[PDB]
Amino acid sequence: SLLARQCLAEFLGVFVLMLLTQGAVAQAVTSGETKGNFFTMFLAGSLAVTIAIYVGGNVSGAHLNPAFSLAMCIVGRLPWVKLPIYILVQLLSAFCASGATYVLYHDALQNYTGGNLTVTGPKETASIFATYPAPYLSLNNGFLDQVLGTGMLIVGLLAILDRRNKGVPAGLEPVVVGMLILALGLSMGANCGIPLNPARDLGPRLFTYVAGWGPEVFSAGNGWWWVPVVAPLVGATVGTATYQLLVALHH
Amino acid sequence: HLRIRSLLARQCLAEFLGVFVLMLLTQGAVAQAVTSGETKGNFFTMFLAGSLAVTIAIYVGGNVSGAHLNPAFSLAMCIVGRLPWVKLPIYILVQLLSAFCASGATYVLYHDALQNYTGGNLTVTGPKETASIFATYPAPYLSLNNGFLDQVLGTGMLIVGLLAILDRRNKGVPAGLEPVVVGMLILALGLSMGANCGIPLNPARDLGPRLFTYVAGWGPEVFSAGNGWWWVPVVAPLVGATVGTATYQLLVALHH
Amino acid sequence: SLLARQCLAEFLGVFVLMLLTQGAVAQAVTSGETKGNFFTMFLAGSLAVTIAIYVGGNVSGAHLNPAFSLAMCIVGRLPWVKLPIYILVQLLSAFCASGATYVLYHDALQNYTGGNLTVTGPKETASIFATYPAPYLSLNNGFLDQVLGTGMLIVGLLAILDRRNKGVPAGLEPVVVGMLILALGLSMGANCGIPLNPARDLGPRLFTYVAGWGPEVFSAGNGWWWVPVVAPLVGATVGTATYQLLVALHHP
Amino acid sequence: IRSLLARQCLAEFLGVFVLMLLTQGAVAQAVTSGETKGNFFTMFLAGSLAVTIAIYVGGNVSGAHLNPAFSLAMCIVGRLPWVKLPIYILVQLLSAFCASGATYVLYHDALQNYTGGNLTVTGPKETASIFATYPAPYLSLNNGFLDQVLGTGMLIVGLLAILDRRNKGVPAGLEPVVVGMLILALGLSMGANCGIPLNPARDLGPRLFTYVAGWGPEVFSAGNGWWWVPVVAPLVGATVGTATYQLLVALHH
Ligand SMILES: CCCCCCCCCO[C@@H]1O[C@H](CO)[C@@H](O)[C@@H](O)[C@H]1O
Ligand SMILES: CCCCCCCCCO[C@@H]1O[C@H](CO)[C@@H](O)[C@@H](O)[C@H]1O
Ligand SMILES: CCCCCCCCCO[C@@H]1O[C@H](CO)[C@@H](O)[C@@H](O)[C@H]1O
Ligand SMILES: CCCCCCCCCO[C@@H]1O[C@H](CO)[C@@H](O)[C@@H](O)[C@H]1O
Ligand SMILES: CCCCCCCCCO[C@@H]1O[C@H](CO)[C@@H](O)[C@@H](O)[C@H]1O
Ligand SMILES: CCCCCCCCCO[C@@H]1O[C@H](CO)[C@@H](O)[C@@H](O)[C@H]1O
Ligand SMILES: CCCCCCCCCO[C@@H]1O[C@H](CO)[C@@H](O)[C@@H](O)[C@H]1O
Ligand SMILES: CCCCCCCCCO[C@@H]1O[C@H](CO)[C@@H](O)[C@@H](O)[C@H]1O
Ligand SMILES: CCCCCCCCCO[C@@H]1O[C@H](CO)[C@@H](O)[C@@H](O)[C@H]1O
Ligand SMILES: CCCCCCCCCO[C@@H]1O[C@H](CO)[C@@H](O)[C@@H](O)[C@H]1O
Ligand SMILES: CCCCCCCCCO[C@@H]1O[C@H](CO)[C@@H](O)[C@@H](O)[C@H]1O
Ligand SMILES: CCCCCCCCCO[C@@H]1O[C@H](CO)[C@@H](O)[C@@H](O)[C@H]1O
Ligand SMILES: CCCCCCCCCO[C@@H]1O[C@H](CO)[C@@H](O)[C@@H](O)[C@H]1O
Ligand SMILES: CCCCCCCCCO[C@@H]1O[C@H](CO)[C@@H](O)[C@@H](O)[C@H]1O
Ligand SMILES: CCCCCCCCCO[C@@H]1O[C@H](CO)[C@@H](O)[C@@H](O)[C@H]1O
Ligand SMILES: CCCCCCCCCO[C@@H]1O[C@H](CO)[C@@H](O)[C@@H](O)[C@H]1O
């Protein structure tokens, strides 16, 4: 079954993406920042994307991201009827990787918290799994952040995926994508941590909702949960339109 | 039916796109470090991000063969006869405009963080100054002379490298990796000669955003600060590109 | 017959691997973290794998790791009867490279330790050579940690080596492996370092046993020493069986 | 320039000059900023970037040598005439001396601000080590000599292996990048004892600069007379490294 094969690729790639991304936050948090910090988190996040894109068969393979799946539907490369299935698989995979992360870091989490799982405050561990905005950040500014960041990402991915573009060399495309993730992380990561990917954010938030952290994962940050869902989708639409226009202006 | 037939228009669009990306990533990383109280960025993160921005922007621009992104490089391309002189004012203006616009986007991207960091007080010098998010300012100890030399050298070295990567009489680095190697050059320059004044090496990258901060809340001190520093990142890199290009060219002439 | 050349490549590669890896820990610990830290240790271990793999003739050359050698047997690329030879050579090279590190950092060890060679305290230097778990880590968590990390490394190496995949540009395979090791170190290095390699751990632990640290190197961490030996082997087996199942799933 | 030796000397001067500007530049950036613009990691990283840039400048690994130790290796394998060895070393030495003056000028204002004009070799505000290397205070001469024999021997074996057109190694056009990875690995694993000068010209030439440029004879007496270890020990490392490389090739063929 082709759909099944496509679904396997999404599940595998999102799983590896999420393990490495979340593991790097758990490493920094539960170690008191003696084995990780903000830079380590951004770098491991960009290496996670490089590796996951390889796992998924490169940029032309798995999407790993509802935002990118939307972009593929817009340009005609993925049938609209398959979009919910992809997003479902990507969400489930991120949910499952959060469980793997929880088990990988069980002793470290227990040691750091004494078993007290919190969303805010000095020992909070909710942000190992999903993102939370900086304390100063309004919903509007956060929405803008993650329209711009995701639209930049999407235009970069589409230009790499576009075979008529002379860009990066065969077999290195995931490495350059990793470079862009790093650049975005270090230049646009301060407001709310470049989730850039609604499955990357909602799947794990749901995991922490049911695995001990409770409803505050949805009320925290002024109801922040829906911004990493909606804004990347807006960013993918605007980014796909921008890219399609640029192509039209060029030939 | 939307195809741009004019070559000049296509070239201008590339300048605009590449400079815009270069400047968003470059200024964003300074803003991230500054506004976060250095908990989300720092000097190293700024130097690394600025060299990543160059790599990414040169890909966006069509590799080193495509967009210039830099009035100093555009001068070099004229000097070696690859850009008609008459197009040079057009390129520089589009570069300036793109950098100005990208500063606007940075300002909107970091509005809440700026307000929180400054309480609304937009200063150019002092513990909480934020003008250096957009344009570059010299260390307090630096004279114009030393600052001038610093930018002549940094920019001259950059241009010579770009010329060597471009020159097809050389063996060249692998196709599709030029931008990565340019990025590595930018990183090296930032860690070895970025202390005096933040290595702008690009008049558009500096003046455009300085003009933005002039009108967007920082006032005329952006032009008086540093003993009238604003003109050094304009003139010195152009002097550096001229000396670098002349140096590259006789070296080549010297081996023929 | 290429057995002797195959052994030489294992010995050379492991030796560069261990010098660079251990040196970076010694540089960090011994300088009071003024010339190294957790991050340079993880990055140095990445560079070391990249350099050692070039030295060993790239991913299809020296194995450098009992867990990869085990994977080569399972998939039928290394004869089972050579597995004990490769592991022995890998173990011996890691033991010798620890001697080289000790000599390299002789004055710095004495300055850091005043001659007191311990495992566990504030001036402990045993973890320059072999890996010890975080104080909170149970043997269960540490075992799972190594099984997962090594399994991920091995799936990555299999996919790079497998010529049915489109591949990574020729002569950059080692650089991409190094990026995986960096990713593993930053995302799952906190529990017990990322030995990922039985010879890289047991070889040097044997060295510290006889070179001055004593039997504590085997009782510390609730008898930690066997976990970096057995867990990467289980990870190699589980990763290999997973790579082969996925693959078979895409064939008839 | 019709003279072959002339063009070869020019290549050595230009390569070493860039190597030194970038290498010393990063130490001045870290020291004179009070480590707000650089630190130990930055110095190691910029050192490794300087080498790959300078090796490009020189025409890749099969171009300029940039290093008395590597030229000795080239003489031993017959790829460079012995009678040209004192010439190469002298040009490498003088390039490093000239590059140190460029560093002093580039960082003139930063140096005055940091020292108040008192140039010292030891103590809280010493600036001598911007230009040349000094050993960790705990290090004996013997241990530093071993440190530089091993570090340089490993560098030389890597470089010979890359030069050796019989080896499948790095993609054409990226050999200087992999050498720079090597220099970073060496800096992070073996840079604590005395930096990783690995290069007699990189060390002596700058030391002679600071000697005449205001730091005085103490650059030669500091570190229990340390100055000759980064001169002699890389030469022994190159010799040992070259024999080792030749042994290993023979062991395969
Ligand atoms: C664990 C660290 C590195 C693992 C790297 C795996 C690289 C090989 C992946 O190839 C792709 O796998 C997809 C499944 O996801 C399939 O759809 C298939 O088409 C194939 O082309
Ligand atoms: C799998 C899709 C289902 C996800 C739905 C989870 C969101 C449930 C709504 O939670 C509420 O969100 C408000 C913001 O609207 C917050 O103010 C807060 O009070 C919170 O209680
Ligand atoms: C990262 C943002 C940049 C995305 C821009 C996508 C534009 C695609 C350009 O296509 C190329 O345009 C040339 C003319 O310019 C043509 O001759 C032809 O070669 C065509 O294939
Ligand atoms: C993040 C890395 C992205 C790699 C590939 C992006 C570049 C692909 C298109 O580039 C170039 O767009 C220029 C406009 O800027 C045009 O002039 C056009 O001729 C085109 O060729
Ligand atoms: C780190 C950035 C430094 C700038 C890179 C310089 C690019 C010039 C590439 O051309 C050639 O690369 C060849 C490899 O084959 C070498 O032989 C060398 O002769 C040179 O002619
Ligand atoms: C429209 C593009 C040009 C941008 C701004 C033009 C120059 C602004 C000049 O400002 C003045 O420059 C003097 C010279 O350094 C300083 O001493 C100080 O008096 C400053 O107030
Ligand atoms: C920092 C480095 C910048 C200086 C650039 C020096 C360029 C040297 C001139 O080119 C060289 O001319 C040789 C003979 O004319 C050719 O055989 C070929 O080798 C070519 O590469
Ligand atoms: C700084 C790293 C530079 C490395 C440049 C290339 C290294 C070449 C390694 O050669 C390999 O040596 C193996 C012995 O270990 C042998 O098995 C042999 O087959 C050979 O292929
Ligand atoms: C203590 C365990 C640590 C290393 C693992 C040892 C693996 C032993 C495998 O033996 C081999 O099994 C093959 C298939 O099972 C058989 O074909 C046969 O060739 C036999 O020789
Ligand atoms: C489950 C997938 C198993 C795939 C394992 C087989 C890997 C193929 C080995 O590669 C080959 O190794 C040679 C040396 O042995 C090299 O010289 C080169 O020719 C290379 O192509
Ligand atoms: C740091 C990440 C390390 C993982 C490297 C993963 C294996 C790379 C093998 O080559 C890749 O094979 C894929 C499967 O065919 C293709 O999709 C193609 O794009 C190609 O590049
Ligand atoms: C050259 C390598 C030799 C192989 C090393 C394996 C021997 C390890 C045994 O440790 C023993 O653990 C005891 C705990 O009961 C200690 O009290 C003491 O008896 C010690 O001897
Ligand atoms: C060639 C491999 C030989 C290595 C043998 C190591 C000796 C075994 C370690 O001794 C004991 O292990 C116990 C449980 O593991 C610990 O609780 C502790 O009491 C320790 O002293
Ligand atoms: C920061 C500046 C980066 C410039 C990189 C320049 C790389 C091109 C240098 O090519 C080589 O120049 C040698 C002179 O040194 C000559 O011998 C000649 O044979 C040529 O092949
Ligand atoms: C630090 C690296 C150690 C150097 C080891 C080099 C000796 C191996 C030489 O033979 C290797 O094998 C084949 C011929 O033997 C070819 O592939 C050849 O080009 C080389 O690869
Ligand atoms: C080719 C140029 C050679 C440069 C070196 C020549 C000067 C030697 C330095 O003099 C003395 O060296 C003694 C030997 O260690 C030290 O004890 C120390 O007191 C120092 O004063």
Side-chain angles (χ1 to χ4, degrees):
Chain A
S1 165
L2 168 71
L3 175 52
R5 199 217 150 247
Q6 307 177 306
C7 286
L8 176 60
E10 301 296 317
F11 186 98
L12 294 178
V14 168
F15 196 93
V16 164
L17 172 73
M18 292 313 306
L19 245 200
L20 296 176
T21 304
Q22 292 173 337
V25 187
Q27 174 150 323
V29 172
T30 66
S31 78
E33 300 216 323
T34 68
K35 310 281 219 223
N37 56 31
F38 79 88
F39 173 75
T40 268
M41 295 178 271
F42 286 130
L43 176 63
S46 81
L47 293 159
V49 169
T50 294
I51 292 149
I53 293 192
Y54 276 123
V55 166
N58 213 323
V59 168
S60 62
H63 304 167
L64 310 200
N65 191 343
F68 190 66
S69 293
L70 179 51
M72 293 299 102
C73 285
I74 292 173
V75 297
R77 190 162 178 270
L78 173 82
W80 284 108
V81 70
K82 297 196 163 174
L83 180 58
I85 298 77
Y86 276 46
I87 299 185
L88 224 313
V89 173
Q90 301 157 350
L91 267 161
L92 186 68
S93 180
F95 187 92
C96 289
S98 305
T101 294
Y102 178 103
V103 171
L104 176 60
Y105 277 94
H106 173 277
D107 294 352
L109 280 165
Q110 185 178 264
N111 181 250
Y112 183 70
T113 64
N116 184 32
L117 306 186
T118 60
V119 184
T120 61
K123 292 274 190 174
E124 71 80 16
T125 46
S127 70
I128 285 164
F129 304 89
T131 67
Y132 296 82
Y136 60 76
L137 189 66
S138 69
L139 300 177
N140 295 351
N141 201 160
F143 190 100
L144 212 148
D145 177 269
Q146 271 322 272
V147 168
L148 174 66
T150 310
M152 287 177 68
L153 178 62
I154 298 295
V155 175
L157 294 174
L158 287 171
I160 290 176
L161 179 83
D162 199 344
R163 290 180 308 233
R164 60 226 154 127
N165 282 143
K166 270 234 268 221
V168 305
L172 289 180
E173 301 91 334
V175 167
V176 172
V177 177
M179 298 189 73
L180 178 54
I181 299 279
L182 218 205
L184 292 167
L186 302 175
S187 298
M188 305 178 190
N191 287 325
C192 62
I194 54 160
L196 265 20
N197 180 334
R200 173 274 185 269
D201 196 79
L202 182 53
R205 196 180 307 280
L206 289 162
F207 173 75
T208 57
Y209 173 59
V210 302
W213 282 265
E216 196 185 345
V217 306
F218 291 113
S219 74
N222 311 121
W224 170 259
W225 70 273
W226 59 267
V227 176
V229 175
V230 171
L233 297 177
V234 175
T237 300
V238 164
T240 303
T242 303
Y243 183 77
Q244 301 289 71
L245 170 64
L246 290 169
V247 169
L249 289 172
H250 288 88
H251 228 144
Chain B
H1 282 312
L2 286 187
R3 198 183 54 94
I4 300 161
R5 284 148 313 188
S6 154
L7 174 57
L8 184 47
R10 286 187 308 257
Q11 288 160 342
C12 288
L13 182 54
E15 294 308 316
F16 196 98
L17 296 190
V19 169
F20 193 93
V21 172
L22 166 79
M23 293 303 315
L24 203 48
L25 293 174
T26 298
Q27 302 175 318
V30 184
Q32 182 149 323
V34 180
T35 63
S36 64
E38 294 188 82
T39 65
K40 298 292 175 148
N42 56 31
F43 78 85
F44 173 70
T45 264
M46 295 173 235
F47 284 135
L48 177 58
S51 78
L52 290 169
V54 172
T55 296
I56 290 139
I58 289 169
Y59 275 120
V60 175
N63 210 318
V64 179
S65 195
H68 299 188
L69 317 187
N70 192 338
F73 192 67
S74 297
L75 182 54
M77 292 304 93
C78 293
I79 288 183
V80 301
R82 187 158 155 162
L83 180 67
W85 286 100
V86 78
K87 291 189 186 186
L88 182 62
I90 309 307
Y91 275 54
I92 288 172
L93 178 288
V94 169
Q95 292 151 6
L96 278 158
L97 171 70
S98 184
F100 184 96
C101 295
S103 306
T106 295
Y107 176 99
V108 164
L109 188 47
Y110 281 87
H111 181 277
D112 289 3
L114 278 159
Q115 185 70 5
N116 178 71
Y117 181 69
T118 71
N121 190 48
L122 300 189
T123 74
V124 176
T125 59
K128 301 279 264 177
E129 67 92 1
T130 50
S132 72
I133 287 168
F134 302 88
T136 68
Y137 295 82
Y141 56 69
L142 187 69
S143 55
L144 299 165
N145 294 340
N146 199 164
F148 196 88
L149 190 132
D150 179 272
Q151 275 309 270
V152 172
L153 182 63
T155 308
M157 290 186 61
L158 170 64
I159 293 283
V160 160
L162 293 171
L163 292 177
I165 294 165
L166 248 201
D167 194 345
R168 292 213 109 268
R169 298 165 301 190
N170 305 330
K171 296 200 192 71
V173 309
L177 290 185
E178 308 95 330
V180 168
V181 161
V182 179
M184 296 183 186
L185 211 206
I186 294 291
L187 183 53
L189 286 182
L191 305 181
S192 296
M193 50 190 74
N196 285 329
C197 47
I199 201 147
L201 321 157
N202 182 319
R205 167 277 179 266
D206 195 77
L207 176 57
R210 194 182 306 285
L211 286 169
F212 177 77
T213 50
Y214 177 68
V215 293
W218 284 262
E221 199 192 339
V222 304
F223 295 108
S224 60
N227 318 139
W229 169 259
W230 70 275
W231 63 267
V232 178
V234 174
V235 179
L238 296 180
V239 164
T242 310
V243 173
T245 297
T247 295
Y248 185 79
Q249 285 205 106
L250 82 152
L251 281 174
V252 167
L254 266 209
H255 285 78
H256 195 103
Chain C
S1 180
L2 12 83
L3 215 207
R5 276 168 287 160
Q6 287 166 335
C7 287
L8 176 69
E10 297 302 322
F11 188 94
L12 248 156
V14 166
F15 191 98
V16 176
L17 175 64
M18 292 310 306
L19 244 215
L20 300 179
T21 297
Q22 296 176 336
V25 183
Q27 172 151 334
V29 169
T30 252
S31 67
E33 302 198 48
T34 62
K35 319 308 277 175
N37 51 42
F38 77 89
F39 169 73
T40 69
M41 285 175 38
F42 286 136
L43 178 68
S46 291
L47 296 169
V49 170
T50 291
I51 311 292
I53 290 181
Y54 275 117
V55 169
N58 212 321
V59 174
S60 67
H63 299 181
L64 309 193
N65 184 342
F68 190 67
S69 293
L70 179 51
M72 289 306 85
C73 294
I74 290 169
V75 303
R77 180 169 184 242
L78 191 73
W80 286 103
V81 303
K82 287 179 168 204
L83 186 57
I85 310 187
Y86 278 50
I87 291 179
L88 187 287
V89 170
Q90 294 158 352
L91 202 68
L92 179 51
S93 173
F95 177 101
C96 296
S98 313
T101 299
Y102 180 97
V103 171
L104 191 51
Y105 280 90
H106 178 274
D107 289 5
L109 286 162
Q110 261 285 333
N111 180 75
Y112 185 71
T113 76
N116 187 18
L117 296 185
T118 63
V119 193
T120 67
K123 294 301 193 196
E124 170 283 310
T125 52
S127 65
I128 289 167
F129 300 86
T131 69
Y132 295 76
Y136 61 71
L137 191 69
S138 66
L139 290 169
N140 294 329
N141 202 165
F143 195 96
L144 181 148
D145 171 88
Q146 276 318 95
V147 167
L148 173 52
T150 312
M152 296 189 57
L153 172 63
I154 290 291
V155 175
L157 292 168
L158 290 175
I160 291 173
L161 194 61
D162 178 349
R163 294 276 304 266
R164 293 161 306 189
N165 305 320
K166 261 312 188 300
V168 127
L172 296 182
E173 301 97 323
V175 170
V176 171
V177 175
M179 303 185 293
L180 212 205
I181 300 285
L182 184 55
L184 293 172
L186 302 182
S187 298
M188 49 191 76
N191 282 329
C192 46
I194 19 150
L196 263 33
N197 182 322
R200 164 276 179 281
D201 192 83
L202 177 58
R205 195 186 306 275
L206 291 167
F207 168 81
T208 59
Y209 175 65
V210 301
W213 285 258
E216 215 130 50
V217 306
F218 292 117
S219 63
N222 303 120
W224 167 256
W225 69 275
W226 60 272
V227 177
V229 171
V230 180
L233 267 20
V234 170
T237 308
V238 171
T240 299
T242 299
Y243 182 84
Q244 287 182 307
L245 164 68
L246 290 166
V247 160
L249 288 171
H250 298 63
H251 275 209
Chain D
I1 304 175
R2 294 182 183 174
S3 175
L4 173 56
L5 176 52
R7 292 179 306 271
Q8 298 175 318
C9 288
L10 181 47
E12 299 289 325
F13 188 98
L14 295 172
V16 167
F17 191 97
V18 173
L19 173 71
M20 291 313 297
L21 241 208
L22 290 178
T23 293
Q24 297 174 339
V27 191
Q29 174 155 326
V31 171
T32 64
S33 72
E35 301 220 315
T36 72
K37 304 274 194 218
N39 57 34
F40 77 90
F41 176 67
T42 269
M43 284 167 294
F44 284 135
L45 180 56
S48 69
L49 290 163
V51 158
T52 128
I53 291 150
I55 283 178
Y56 276 120
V57 168
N60 216 317
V61 168
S62 66
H65 306 164
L66 278 35
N67 187 337
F70 183 66
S71 302
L72 176 55
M74 290 303 106
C75 289
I76 289 166
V77 300
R79 216 189 147 254
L80 173 78
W82 282 107
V83 70
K84 280 191 171 161
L85 178 54
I87 296 70
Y88 278 48
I89 289 171
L90 205 198
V91 169
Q92 303 160 348
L93 207 47
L94 171 154
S95 183
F97 183 98
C98 295
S100 300
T103 296
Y104 178 100
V105 171
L106 180 62
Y107 280 92
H108 175 266
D109 289 351
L111 242 11
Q112 238 291 173
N113 179 248
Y114 178 80
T115 71
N118 306 291
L119 307 173
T120 57
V121 178
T122 62
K125 286 275 193 158
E126 67 82 13
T127 44
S129 60
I130 289 161
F131 303 90
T133 69
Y134 294 85
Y138 59 76
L139 189 73
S140 65
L141 295 174
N142 292 349
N143 195 168
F145 194 97
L146 195 144
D147 172 274
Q148 277 312 277
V149 175
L150 172 55
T152 310
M154 297 177 67
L155 175 63
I156 290 293
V157 169
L159 289 165
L160 297 169
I162 292 155
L163 255 199
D164 194 335
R165 280 168 300 162
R166 291 169 308 185
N167 293 330
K168 287 170 79 175
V170 189
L174 294 175
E175 301 97 331
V177 172
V178 173
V179 174
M181 288 177 96
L182 209 203
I183 296 285
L184 215 211
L186 286 174
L188 302 178
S189 300
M190 312 185 26
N193 287 328
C194 53
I196 31 160
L198 306 166
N199 177 330
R202 173 265 184 281
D203 196 78
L204 222 205
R207 192 178 311 283
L208 286 156
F209 172 84
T210 56
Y211 174 60
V212 303
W215 284 258
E218 194 182 331
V219 300
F220 286 117
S221 65
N224 288 305
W226 167 260
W227 72 271
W228 60 268
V229 173
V231 177
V232 167
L235 300 182
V236 167
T239 305
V240 160
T242 301
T244 302
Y245 185 76
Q246 297 295 75
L247 203 222
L248 288 175
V249 163
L251 273 163
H252 286 88
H253 300 291

